[PDB]
Structure 1
Amino acid sequence: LVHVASVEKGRSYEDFQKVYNAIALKLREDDEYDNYIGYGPVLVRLAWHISGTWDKHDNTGGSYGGTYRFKKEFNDPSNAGLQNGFKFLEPIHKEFPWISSGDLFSLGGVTAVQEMQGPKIPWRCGRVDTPEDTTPDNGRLPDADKDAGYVRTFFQRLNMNDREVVALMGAHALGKTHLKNSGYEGGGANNVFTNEFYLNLLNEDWKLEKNDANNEQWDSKSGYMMLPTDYSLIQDPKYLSIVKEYANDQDKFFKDFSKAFEKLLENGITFPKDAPSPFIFKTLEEQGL
C-alpha cells in the first residue's frame, strides 16, 4: 500500500502561499470563537486527528487521503468538536477548489502554529483525495485516561520515539478542554504558542480530582488542568527528563516540535525523488499584511 504524493496540476509555491494567507487572514478576523481564543487551537487539533489515524504496519490512515470529509471519520466520537475547524476551512476550500482535502487540513495546522507565533513548519503538497472506502474505522486515536505505558505504546504505531512524543504534547499549551466534546473541563485558554505546558507541569501543585463528567483529571489551584496522559509525562523517568529540557530551552522545544509535527503530517506519504522541496511559508506579519 503506497501513497504517492502528486502535486496539484500546475500549482507552485505562490499558489499555496495564497491559501496560507486566506487561512491566516480568517484566523485574525474570526477572532470571537470559543470566548475569543479563536480557531488556531482547534485547527491544530484537526491536523493532528486527521494524521493520527496512521498505522505504520499496513500504511492505512494518516493525512494523505483527506478521509475526514467522509461521515464515518467525521463522526468518530474522538473527533467531537472538530466540525468547528471543518466549518472554518469550508469557505477557504470553496475559494481554492484546486487544493486536495488532506493538503488543506494539514496546511491549516501549519498556518495556525505559525500565526500563533510558533516555529516555522516546513510543509509539502501533494496529498490526493482517496475514495470513501479508504476511510479508517473509528478507534485509532488515543484515550486520555491512561498512563505513560499506554502513551509510549500508542505512539509507536505512528513511529514516534520518546522525544517526538514529548515535543508533540507541548501543543497542549494551546486551547482548552470542553466538557461536551471530551468529558474534560478547564484549561488555560491560550492562543500563543509557547513552552508553557512543560513549565506548568513542573511548577504547579497538582491535585487529582473527579470532574463533573466523572472523569479523573489533574487540577491546580491556579486554574490549569492536565489530562492523565499529560501528567504521565512527569511520572515516567524518560519523559520527565525531556520535559525538563523543554521547560529550560524554548528554542530546542520549537525546533523539535517543528520536526515532529512535519513528520506527523507526512507519515504514510511517499515523495518522489523529484518532488518540490518543502515550502516554508511567510507569516502575515512577515509580508506586512
Structure 2
Amino acid sequence: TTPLVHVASVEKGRSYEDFQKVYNAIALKLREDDEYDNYIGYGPVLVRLAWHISGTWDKHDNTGGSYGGTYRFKKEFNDPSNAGLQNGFKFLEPIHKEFPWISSGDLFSLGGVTAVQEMQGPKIPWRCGRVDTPEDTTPDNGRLPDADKDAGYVRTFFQRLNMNDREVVALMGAHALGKTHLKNSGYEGPWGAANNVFTNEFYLNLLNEDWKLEKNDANNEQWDSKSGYMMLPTDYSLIQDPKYLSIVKEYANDQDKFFKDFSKAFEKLLENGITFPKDAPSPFIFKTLEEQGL
C-alpha cells in the first residue's frame, strides 16, 4: 500500500537559472558575513544544517528527511540536538525573503550544497522539488545521532539513512569544517586547522595525530591531540573499526576519491525520501562564485 510517498514538484515556473540566483545569493552572503564564529564564517553551520534537516529521515516509514522543510516549526527548531543551527536559519531567512517562492527544504539543502562548493569542495549535483508540509508531519526529537558512541552505533544509525560503510566514512569527512562548541553540544574544539576550506584533513588528522581521551569542561569525554584538535567518540570510532579504518586511509591518501564519494553520498543524504518523477529535470550543477569571476 505503501509509506508516505513524497513526490517532488518543481516550484511553479522555475528552472536552473532561478536556482543559480539563490545559490549566488547564499554564496555572496557567505563571502560578506565572514566575521561569524571567529572568522570561520557561516559555511560549516550551513552544511551541518543541511545534514540535520536530512538526517531526521527514517527509511522504514519515510518520515523526516529534507522534503517537508519541517525545521521551520518549533519542535524540530528547539531539538536539543540542533543547538547552534539557529544561526544558519537566521542566515537563510533574508535569502528566503528575497526568494519567497523557494520551499524551506530546497533552501536548507541548497545552503549545504552552496557552502561545500564555496569552500573549494566538490561539485554537488542538486535537485529541486521539495514541498513544505503541515505541522503534523514534524519528526519527533531524538532522530539525530549521539556523539558519545562507538562504531557499532555509527553503522547501525546510518543504516536508518540507507548509508553503507563507504558513504558514512565519506559523509563524516565534512567534519574538516568548523568546530564543536561547548555551549551547543558539550564538546569543544576544531577537528582541523583548515576550518572553512573543504579538504581530506579529517582523515589525515585521524591517522597522523596522537590522540588522548580527556574530559572537557562539560564533563564529556573527547579525543584531543597536542596540535589543539579534537575528535568526537563517533569520529574516533572510524579508526577503531577495521572496515572503517581502511576507507579512512583510502581518503587520507586520495582527496579526489573522497571528493567523488562525498559528492554522491551528500546528494543522496539530501535526497533521501524524495521520489523524483521522470518528466523532472536532470540534477543541477551550479557554477561557483569563482567560476562567475567573483
User: Which interval holds the TM-score relative to the shorter structure?
Assistant: over 0.9
CA distance in 2, matches of 1:189, 1:288: 24
Q: Deviations over 1:200-232 (max 9, x none)?
A: 000000000011110000000010000000000
Cα distance per residue 1:176-203 (max 9 Å; x no partner): 0100000001164600000000000000
Distance 2:131 2:6 in 1: 8
Distance in 2 separating the partners of 1:188 and 1:43:
19
Q: Deviations over 1:71-127 (max 9, x none)?
A: 000000000010000000000000000000000000000000000000000000000
C-alpha separation in 2, matches of 1:71 and 1:116: 30
The structural deviation recorded for 1:255 is: 0.2
Number of equivalences: 289
2:5 to 2, 20, 24: 2
Offset of residue 267 of structure 1: 0.3
1:222-258 CA distance string (max 9 Å, x none): 1000000000000000000000000000100000000
Partner of 1:254: 259
Aligned partners of 2:163 and 2:198: how far apart in 1? 22
Distance 1:29 1:93 in 2: 17
Is the 8 Å Cα contact of residues 67 and 73 (structure 1) preserved in structure 2?
A: yes
Q: 1:157 offset after TM fit, Å? A: 0.3
Identity %, equivalent residues: 100
Q: Give me the whole-angstrom Cα distance separating, in 1, the residues matched to 2:198 and 2:232.
A: 19
Question: C-alpha separation between the residues in 1 aligned to 2:138 and 2:210?
Answer: 42
| 2:101 equivalent among 88, 95, 98 | 98
* Distance (whole Å) between structure 1 residues aligned to residue 226 and residue 21 of structure 2: 44
Q: Which residue of 1 aligns with 2:140?
A: 137
Contact 1:175 1:188 in 2 (8 A): no
Distance 1:128 1:40 in 2: 24
Structure 1 distance, partners of 2:197, 2:288, is 14
Q: Is the Cα contact below 8 Å between 1:176 and 1:189 reproduced in 2?
A: no
Matching residue of 1:24: 27
Q: Distance in 1 between matches of 2:108 and 2:145?
A: 20
Q: Residues 1-289 of structure 1 correspond to what in structure 2 (within 5 A)?
A: 1-186=4-189, 188=193, 190-289=195-294
| Paired residue secondary structure (2:7) | coil
Conserved in 2, the CA contact under 8 Å of 1:176 and 1:188? Answer: no
Distance 1:89 1:75 in 2: 17
Structure 2: distance between partners of 1:283 and 1:245 = 28
Contact 1:144 1:229 in 2 (8 A): yes
Q: Matched residues in 2 for 1:255 and 1:135: separation?
A: 32
SS in 2 for 1:140: coil
- 4+ residue segments displaced more than 3 Å: none
Cα distance in 2 between the residues matched to 1:35 and 1:204: 24
Question: SS of the counterpart of 1:287?
Answer: coil
TM-score normalised by the chain length of structure 2? 0.98
Over 3 Å counting, the alpha-carbon distance change for 1:189 and 1:244 in structure 2 is: closer
User: 2 CA distance for matches of 1:138 and 1:219?
Assistant: 29
Seen in structure 2, the aligned counterparts of structure 1 residues 73 and 189 have a Cα distance that, compared at 3 Å, is: farther
Structure 1 CA distance, aligned partners of 2:40 and 2:113?
Answer: 17
Question: Which residues of structure 1 form unaligned runs of 5+?
Answer: none
Summarize deviations over 1:37-94 as a string: whole Å, max 9, x none.
Answer: 0000000000000000000000000000000000000000000010000000000000
Residue 274 of structure 1: CA displacement? 1.0
**Separation (CA, whole Å) in 1 of partners of 2:254 and 2:120:** 16
In 2, Cα distance between equivalents of 1:87 and 1:17? 21
